[PDB]
Amino acid sequence: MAVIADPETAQGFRLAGLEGYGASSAEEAQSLLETLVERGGYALVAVDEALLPDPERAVERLMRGRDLPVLLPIAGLKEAFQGHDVEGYMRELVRKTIGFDIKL
Amino acid sequence: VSPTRMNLLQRRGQLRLAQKGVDLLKKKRDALVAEFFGLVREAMEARKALDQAAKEAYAALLLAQAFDGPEVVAGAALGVPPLEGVEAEVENVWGSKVPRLKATFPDGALLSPVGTPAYTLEASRAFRRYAEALIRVANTETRLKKIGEEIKKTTRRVNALEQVV
Amino acid sequence: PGGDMSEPVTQSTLRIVGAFWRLDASLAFRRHFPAINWNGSYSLFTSALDPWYRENVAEDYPELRDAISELLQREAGLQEIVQLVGPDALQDAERLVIEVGRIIREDFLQQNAYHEVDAYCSMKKAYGIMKMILAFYKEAEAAIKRGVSIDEILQLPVLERIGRARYVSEEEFPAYFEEAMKEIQGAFKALA
Amino acid sequence: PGGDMSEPVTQSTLRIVGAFWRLDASLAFRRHFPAINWNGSYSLFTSALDPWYRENVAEDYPELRDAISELLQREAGLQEIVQLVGPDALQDAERLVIEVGRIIREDFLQQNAYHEVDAYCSMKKAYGIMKMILAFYKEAEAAIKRGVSIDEILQLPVLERIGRARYVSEEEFPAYFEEAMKEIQGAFKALA
Amino acid sequence: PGGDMSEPVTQSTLRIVGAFWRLDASLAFRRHFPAINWNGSYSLFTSALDPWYRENVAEDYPELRDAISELLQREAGLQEIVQLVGPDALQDAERLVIEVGRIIREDFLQQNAYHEVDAYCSMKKAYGIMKMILAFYKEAEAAIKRGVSIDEILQLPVLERIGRARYVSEEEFPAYFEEAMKEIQGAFKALA
Amino acid sequence: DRTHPIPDLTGYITEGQIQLSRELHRKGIYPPIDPLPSLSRLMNNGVGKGKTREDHKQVSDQLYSAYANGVDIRKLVAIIGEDALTENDRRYLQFADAFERFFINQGQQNRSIEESLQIAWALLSMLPQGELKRISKDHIGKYYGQKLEEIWGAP
Amino acid sequence: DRTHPIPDLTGYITEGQIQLSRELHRKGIYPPIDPLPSLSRLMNNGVGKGKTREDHKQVSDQLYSAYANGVDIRKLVAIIGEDALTENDRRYLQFADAFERFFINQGQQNRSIEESLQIAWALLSMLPQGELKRISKDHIGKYYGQKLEEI
């Protein structure tokens, strides 16, 4: 529904019918995400990884008791055409969830 | 408690019950971690699929940005109806209720603007595939988060029983 | 003296009597009477009295009381898990077992020695109450196997009739029992 | 009676004896036939016996014994995570530690009392086995740090050589020990 | 013997004395002195001395003491919860009351007999310390309601002023107390 | 209480014990002998070849392990439900129920040793072949396969 | 058992006691002296200025408080895990680990009082200045800030 990323790909998201929103800074993306969650949690929120590594961490206090507005990070267009550490992201997620490093 | 033989027998029974409960909770944690190991591989595969869809969608988008002017795609995005009413059903996972996003339709692909150049049209479908993979990734990540919370709770309870009571 | 059954007189009389009715202090504190600890009580005259029960109460009375005792044993077994994790973490079948055990305790085992009617119950009245409870349990189990959630069952109207059956007088009981059985059949048959 | 260490007899015994060899039924249940638990056992004679060991066995025997004990302790410290996620999900170094502990348990501590050769063992054979195990551990750790996969290391026939060592006759042991040390040196980095 | 308060001497003494100052081994292990268990101790003269406290110490001394005692009871009650799940899993008010309980039990109850100044404490000094602690508690509650985080409050520099209050001499204490009160009332206003 | 002086000394002198269960008695099973806490110290010297049958010890210990596992699964299914259980857990649950129904609850019957071994093999047949880690392949080939509808405790 | 009549009655007569710990012994620590149960009642007569060093008593008090904090943090970690710890709690936990590794463990070294005080100040350097409430501000800065471990 709602996407936070660079303004260039926000045009494509709007072209898809999604509520693409433009941002270019970590603090600016944090402010935009706070604005989105404050004005209603109905929209699903795709945040860009470079702008925000852990989207739920930034608005963790405001997201207390919130279930519908799920937040996840996305790589972005500049990083899309480059090698993506899918193993690193999964290892970090497993470490956060279970408190261990078990990737072997 | 009052020191008496009956109280002593009651305490010994309580100790036996605590040990049996510890064993049962450890078995439950074993089942949970098996499910977690399955979900980790599922999430990794979904993330790889999303990455591939992202690559192809961005390649499609950038191609139309140079062959056609940005004003054309801007007008097309202004003319397309927005997306609304994405299904948000709930799912039961080990008792706790987890949301499950379900993109029923990207408005059904029912409306398009009057100006539809060849390069622009393919870009929108790429973004639709992008979104329908992103929803799957989000659902899987929510499932792993719930299972991880359950595992952490069980481990905390087991530690409390083994080291306090 | 201290409530300790390890006291020598209690042990000496424990090896001689043919029936033992241990009293629970927890039930007495809760004002749940007769306050008899079902786990710690027993009787050695069960088998010898079976022909009399068959001839004078009903042909299947021993089977009914055995089923009730097995239900109580299963509830006692599940109470350990209930204390470990809480009553909400159980499945639907175990929740039903717990609820049926609670109903048995509150509506069949409990008895008011001061009430005009409840102070004395004949064998046939107890047999009818047991039959009602067992029929309700079978219906509820069948309903749960059909996907009906445990919360709807606990709200069924027939529970008030089951709870109130103990206060019906002896000569009013035969018709009330048949009405309760038909209502129990109808409530589950019509709903699902 | 009951196997409780708080009995007055056990407490009086533990205040005067020099060594305590704790047997376990659990170890015997796992076919660890000597069945002596190394976590609960202890001895107070090692420090006074070191000078004799340094002259009749070898000059660095106490160091080897201490290193083996430390490796066993490190194995025991990792037994929680291996119970949680399983051995296959560990890192390379921890998996190597677990494997070395398994090698020790199955090849050095374990002893067959009904075998015609393994029923008895001299101090020199034990020293040789400890030396071989420690050398293999050092080589494997270096290989792991270099970038060799752990599963590849698990396929080396040097493990098969080491496992058979305790069945070698006392007369023929030194030649086998020299050949096995040469093989340990010639494995790993000698063939990448 | 063994710190057992069910000793015949202790039980026979407790039937006639008007106060009971119970020493705790756990407090002495942490070097918390005088190591008086404020949960197991009591006194029967506290209600009869209120007019003297009003006439000689302050008009609202009993209310301040009761508030301090209530806060200490609340943190003692939350201790068992916090020791199982961790402070971070609690609400902001609970974290604040835990922190103020720590401040009370480390800056008011503790007293050093071998220190040159802290050895003796008058009633006015204790009243001032209690006033400072309670004023800080009220201001922290107001700030937390305004939305300030717990850690930002914890890292305030006036907590150090409160912590060193008991080491201040009797002569200089009123000026230190007034300045600390001004700092307490001015710190949160700037923090907004 | 097994720490009472009388049972304590009796165990300290005698070899093993047979333990009755109150749970089995209240569940309608007779004789209510609980196999898990029971133990015979001289059992290994009275069974084997030329004494009972050559597969006695392995059948006994396989029954012990399978019953313990089934009891554990029965405890676990109460909280996690039957969906989370694998196929093997369901097999163990069914085995435990059938074991309590047929092996223990024999009533007033006089069973020969061969009849008891036959019922034991019929009960073991419910488990998948290859789960019987404690039984050698020869005995499995010779005896595994029959069903409860030929030989069982309610004929 | 510290409640047994022999040690209990001995404690009522003597000035303090030195208590050993089985956990420290099993962790390969010598001498395995557990500082929390240990006590010395005549210590304040012998330490001070004009004897030993002036900061002796305050350093001992700060060490006791910090080690108690580390022990309770260790107790908390065994329930919820390390990853949930606050930065201050992690600092106290690693302080307790370093204390057990370096201060208690000696071997057969004949450490003098100055060396022991140097090691103690190095250990207290791991904590943030301002948490040392037991120590007067003068001794801090004069001795605070030593390198983590010279060993």
Side-chain angles (χ1 to χ4, degrees), chain C residues 43 45-70 108-109 121-132 134 173 177:
Chain C
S43 161
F45 298 103
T46 292
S47 76
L49 302 181
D50 275 338
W52 193 91
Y53 288 136
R54 294 190 200 279
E55 282 205 339
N56 292 64
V57 182
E59 193 65 34
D60 64 339
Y61 171 88
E63 283 78 36
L64 261 70
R65 64 149 155 73
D66 295 344
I68 292 295
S69 74
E70 284 158 34
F108 181 69
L109 302 189
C121 279
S122 66
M123 298 305 297
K124 291 183 178 284
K125 177 162 171 184
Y127 168 72
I129 294 171
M130 287 197 299
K131 184 177 285 292
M132 279 163 48
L134 283 183
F173 198 84
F177 169 62

Side-chain angles (χ1 to χ4, degrees), chain G residues 84-94:
Chain G
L85 284 175
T86 302
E87 181 61 30
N88 291 309
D89 300 1
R90 210 180 335 266
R91 203 177 296 113
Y92 273 101
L93 180 84
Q94 64 203 15

Side-chain angles (χ1 to χ4, degrees), chain C:
Chain C
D4 176 34
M5 310 270 159
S6 298
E7 189 274 331
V9 179
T10 308
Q11 296 304 316
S12 302
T13 190
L14 186 57
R15 299 190 307 272
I16 188 68
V17 302
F20 198 63
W21 302 325
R22 190 190 303 238
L23 295 191
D24 210 333
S26 73
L27 292 186
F29 281 179
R30 200 175 276 110
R31 262 66 169 175
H32 174 275
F33 301 118
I36 292 170
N37 176 245
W38 169 92
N39 192 48
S41 306
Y42 65 87
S43 161
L44 297 177
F45 298 103
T46 292
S47 76
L49 302 181
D50 275 338
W52 193 91
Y53 288 136
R54 294 190 200 279
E55 282 205 339
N56 292 64
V57 182
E59 193 65 34
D60 64 339
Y61 171 88
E63 283 78 36
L64 261 70
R65 64 149 155 73
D66 295 344
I68 292 295
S69 74
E70 284 158 34
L71 275 169
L72 283 173
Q73 178 52 43
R74 291 210 292 133
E75 190 256 336
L78 290 174
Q79 280 290 346
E80 314 174 17
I81 303 170
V82 178
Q83 279 302 135
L84 181 75
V85 302
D88 186 74
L90 288 175
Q91 300 293 301
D92 279 346
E94 280 68 45
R95 199 68 207 278
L96 173 67
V97 172
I98 294 300
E99 293 307 318
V100 169
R102 194 219 79 237
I103 286 163
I104 288 165
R105 262 196 289 286
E106 281 193 311
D107 306 346
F108 181 69
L109 302 189
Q110 187 163 14
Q111 189 160 3
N112 198 351
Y114 296 131
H115 188 260
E116 201 274 319
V117 172
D118 196 28
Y120 166 83
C121 279
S122 66
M123 298 305 297
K124 291 183 178 284
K125 177 162 171 184
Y127 168 72
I129 294 171
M130 287 197 299
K131 184 177 285 292
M132 279 163 48
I133 281 172
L134 283 183
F136 174 90
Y137 173 65
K138 305 308 170 58
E139 294 311 308
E141 175 154 83
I144 290 173
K145 278 187 65 173
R146 293 198 309 278
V148 186
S149 171
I150 193 72
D151 298 349
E152 291 77 359
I153 284 171
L154 274 160
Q155 302 301 132
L156 285 170
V158 299
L159 284 199
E160 72 91 14
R161 280 207 193 257
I162 293 184
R164 197 56 43 164
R166 42 184 262 189
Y167 288 121
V168 176
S169 88
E170 285 282 337
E171 77 283 336
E172 297 166 30
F173 198 84
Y176 180 91
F177 169 62
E178 307 293 341
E179 304 315 316
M181 292 301 285
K182 275 183 286 183
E183 190 184 81
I184 284 173
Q185 293 299 326
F188 277 93
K189 273 186 60 69
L191 196 58

Side-chain angles (χ1 to χ4, degrees), chain F residues 29-136:
Chain F
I29 296 155
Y30 173 82
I33 296 163
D34 196 356
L36 291 175
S38 301
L39 168 65
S40 176
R41 286 194 167 211
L42 302 194
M43 170 182 176
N44 293 305
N45 302 289
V47 303
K49 208 163 56 84
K51 313 182 291 291
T52 76
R53 210 166 70 192
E54 73 262 25
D55 56 354
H56 194 147
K57 175 173 176 282
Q58 294 179 355
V59 163
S60 168
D61 61 41
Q62 190 56 65
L63 284 173
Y64 191 95
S65 56
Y67 187 59
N69 206 43
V71 165
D72 294 347
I73 300 307
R74 188 196 279 154
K75 282 194 187 183
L76 183 68
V77 66
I79 51 182
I80 80 166
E82 210 171 311
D83 283 338
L85 296 185
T86 69
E87 197 62 35
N88 280 37
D89 305 337
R90 294 182 192 94
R91 306 292 275 282
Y92 281 118
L93 194 61
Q94 296 171 17
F95 160 83
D97 180 54
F99 185 81
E100 268 166 28
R101 177 181 169 201
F102 289 109
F103 201 74
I104 311 185
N105 194 23
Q106 77 180 67
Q108 299 285 328
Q109 301 167 24
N110 183 9
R111 283 181 185 167
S112 164
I113 180 58
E114 299 96 330
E115 298 174 71
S116 302
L117 277 185
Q118 288 288 347
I119 294 161
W121 269 112
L123 285 179
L124 284 171
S125 304
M126 290 162 60
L127 263 48
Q129 190 183 348
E131 286 293 271
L132 318 179
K133 257 66 184 178
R134 295 175 175 74
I135 306 175
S136 80

